[PDB]
Structures are given as structure tokens and as C-alpha cells.
Amino acid sequence: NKLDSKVSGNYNYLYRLFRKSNLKPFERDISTEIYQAGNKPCNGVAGF
């Protein structure tokens, strides 16, 4: 709490809220593609 906290907040740290499938053990994904939950294609931009 004395190193990884900022009053402004720390954005240098990120987590993956949504992924299509659960990761296999000891697997690391560094992809920054859009999670296409919807049938309609996000096509690199946010949407419904």
C-alpha cells in the first residue's frame, strides 16, 4: 500500500476483466485485441 497506491491512482497496472476462454495453467496472454462478446464485430472500437 506504500508503493503501489497513488492519490491520483496507478494505471501502470492492468488486469483482464473479460476473456473468451479460461487460461490453461502457467499461460500468459499479452494480447490487446477487443473481446467481441457481441455477434456484431467491434472492429477495433468499443460499442454495444
Place this chain on the structure above:
Amino acid sequence: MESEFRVYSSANNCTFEYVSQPFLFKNLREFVFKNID
């Protein structure tokens, strides 16, 4: 020789670099690749 040439164009967030002794009339060379855990 043209070295790496057209094998790759760019490298992003490269996290690994193992360099060791090279892996490789006819010579049979057999390899088995497994990706487990």
C-alpha cells in the same frame, strides 16, 4: 547470407531469448514438440 531477413518484421514485448548450442548422404533429425501447462 541475408541473416534473419523476412522471417519477422517487428518485435513487441519480447519476453524470451534462450541461446545455446545449435539443434541441427542424408541426416535424419527427429523432433517432438509438446506444450503442456
